[PDB]
Structures are given as C-alpha cells and as structure tokens.
C-alpha cells in the first residue's frame, strides 16, 4: 500500500508540472522515490499511472454521453480487433526444445 500510494501521488503531481518531483528529488534525498529512474522496474507502471492521470486532464469540462447501443457497438468492434491478430500465439515450445537439447 505504501509503494502504491507514493507511486500514485508522485504520479499525481508529476502529471501536472513534472517540475515538483525534479525539485523534490534534489531537496529531500530519500531512497523512497527510487522508482523515478527507469532502472527501477516499478518505474514502468509509474509511466502508466501518470499517462492515465494525463488522460483525465484531457476531457476535464467534457461529459461522456455514450448510449447503450454505442457501448455495445464499441465492445463488438474491440472483440473484432482482438480477433484480427490470432496468428502470433504459436511460438513457445521452441525454448523447451532448446532446454531438452542442452539437458
């Protein structure tokens, strides 16, 4: 919960200015925000959260008025996009083969 909270908070601020965190890092000097560097794995998820928040800033002042029909149409189109690429999940037994060989 701690990690999550700090990631999401620094992500909240990082989403508006990007200058408050770059100042915080130099002011405090704590191994707490070590996720700021792309080295720390969690960093990636960070890049997600921020993006997401960045997105909320997109239509602030705009309402979503999607209807039932539309939502359905959308979900049906999303399922068609997932069925578009069905010839890419057939490569994994290879590694196993290698292992058998070396063993």
């Amino acid at each position: 919960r701690r990690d999550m909270e700090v990631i999401k908070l620094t992500a909240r601020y990082y989403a508006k200015d990007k200058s408050i965190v770059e100042q915080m890092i130099s002011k405090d000097g704590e191994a707490r925000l070590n996720f700021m560097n792309s080295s720390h794995p969690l960093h990636k998820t960070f890049t997600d959260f921020v993006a997401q928040y960045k997105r909320v800033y997109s239509f602030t002042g705009q309402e979503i008025k999607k209807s039932k029909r539309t939502i359905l149409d959308n979900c049906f189109e999303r399922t068609q996009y997932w069925e578009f690429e069905k010839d890419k999940d057939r490569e994994h037994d290879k590694l196993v083969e290698l292992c058998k060989i070396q063993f």
Binding site: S67, K68, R69, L72
Partner: protein, 53 residues
C-alpha cells in the same frame, strides 16, 4: 395495422375485453424486453410512445 381495430374479436368497449387486453399487452411487453435484454428498453419505449402521439 388495422384488423385489431376494424375486425375486433369483441366489442372494444366491453369491460371484460378491455381488462383482458390490458393483462395480455403487459405480458407481451415484459416478455419482449425479457427476451432481448441487450436492447435499450427506454429507447424502444420512447420510440413507441412518440409514434403513438
């Protein structure tokens, strides 16, 4: 579109008849929306109402 109006089983001002017709109508409608959850019920309702008016 016209038969139920101009060739009625009973006289359309008969009590028993109008009551029956009410119950039946209700049934058919609930059945309709029951068998097709995915369609926006309110949309259909309003469409019909506006066609009526």
């Amino acid at each position: 579109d016209e038969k139920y109006l101009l060739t009625p089983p009973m006289d359309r001002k008969n009590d028993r008849y109008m009551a029956f017709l009410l119950k039946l109508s209700k049934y058919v409608e609930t059945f309709f929306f029951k068998s097709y959850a995915l369609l926006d019920a309110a949309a259909v309702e309003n469409l019909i109402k506006s066609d009526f008016e």
